[PDB]
Design an enzyme around this catalytic site. Structure first.
Site, short mmCIF file in Angstrom:
data_model
loop_
_atom_site.label_atom_id
_atom_site.label_comp_id
_atom_site.label_asym_id
_atom_site.label_seq_id
_atom_site.Cartn_x
_atom_site.Cartn_y
_atom_site.Cartn_z
N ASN A 46 0.68 -30.20 21.99
CA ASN A 46 0.37 -31.15 20.91
C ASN A 46 -0.20 -30.40 19.72
O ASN A 46 -0.62 -29.25 19.84
CB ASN A 46 -0.62 -32.22 21.38
CG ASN A 46 -0.12 -32.99 22.62
OD1 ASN A 46 0.94 -33.49 22.59
ND2 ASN A 46 -0.86 -33.00 23.68
N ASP A 48 -2.95 -30.75 18.18
CA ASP A 48 -4.34 -30.42 18.30
C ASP A 48 -4.57 -29.24 19.20
O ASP A 48 -5.74 -28.92 19.45
CB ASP A 48 -5.17 -31.60 18.81
CG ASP A 48 -4.80 -32.08 20.20
OD1 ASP A 48 -4.07 -31.43 20.94
OD2 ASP A 48 -5.27 -33.14 20.58
N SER A 50 -3.86 -29.17 22.45
CA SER A 50 -3.84 -29.56 23.84
C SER A 50 -2.36 -29.52 24.34
O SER A 50 -1.40 -29.38 23.56
CB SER A 50 -4.48 -30.94 24.01
OG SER A 50 -3.65 -31.91 23.44
N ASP A 101 -9.50 -46.51 32.72
CA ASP A 101 -10.40 -46.02 31.66
C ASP A 101 -10.68 -47.02 30.56
O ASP A 101 -11.47 -46.73 29.65
CB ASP A 101 -9.74 -44.79 30.99
CG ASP A 101 -10.71 -43.90 30.27
OD1 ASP A 101 -11.75 -43.55 30.90
OD2 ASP A 101 -10.40 -43.51 29.10
#
Ligand SMILES: [Cl-]
Ligand code: NA
Length: 129
Positions: A46, A48, A50, A101
């Site tokens: 990704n 970012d 990650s 979550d």
């Protein structure tokens, strides 16, 4: 391993994903189809920094440790490489934590954009389950 559709449906069922937190099995098969094309070895990086791992493209910023995502959490407490195994157990177990979550299966962008609101039962049509 590249799963077949009904083969994966049966493995997910055995690992307790059918109706887990309300999401029928077809949702999980649909998500795996569009996240990874049913390929346990799929990885994608990704912007970012990650990386997403395995059949359900679990992300290294929150869920697993890949040794190269600065300041990430490892909430499933596993190396990200364990998510690439032909045994889907670690992926399933980590997916259960993700989906509990708070925003459910919307955590999987491909599920939200390609599965949500569709006739997901079609993904298990024909299978011996
Ligand atoms: Cl939900
Ligand atoms: Na991490």
């Amino acid at each position: 391993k590249v799963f077949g559709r009904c083969e994966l449906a049966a493995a997910m069922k055995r690992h307790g994903l059918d109706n887990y937190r309300g999401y029928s099995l077809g949702n999980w098969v649909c998500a795996a189809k569009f996240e990874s094309n049913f390929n346990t070895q799929a990885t994608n990086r990704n912007t970012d920094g990650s990386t997403d791992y395995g059949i359900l493209q679990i992300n290294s910023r929150w869920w697993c440790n890949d040794g190269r995502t600065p300041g990430s959490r490892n909430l499933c407490n596993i190396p990200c490489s364990a998510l690439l195994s032909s045994d889907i157990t670690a992926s399933v177990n980590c997916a259960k934590k993700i989906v509990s979550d708070g925003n459910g299966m919307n955590a999987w962008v491909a599920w939200r954009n390609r599965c949500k609101g569709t006739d997901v039962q079609a993904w298990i049509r024909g299978c011996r389950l």
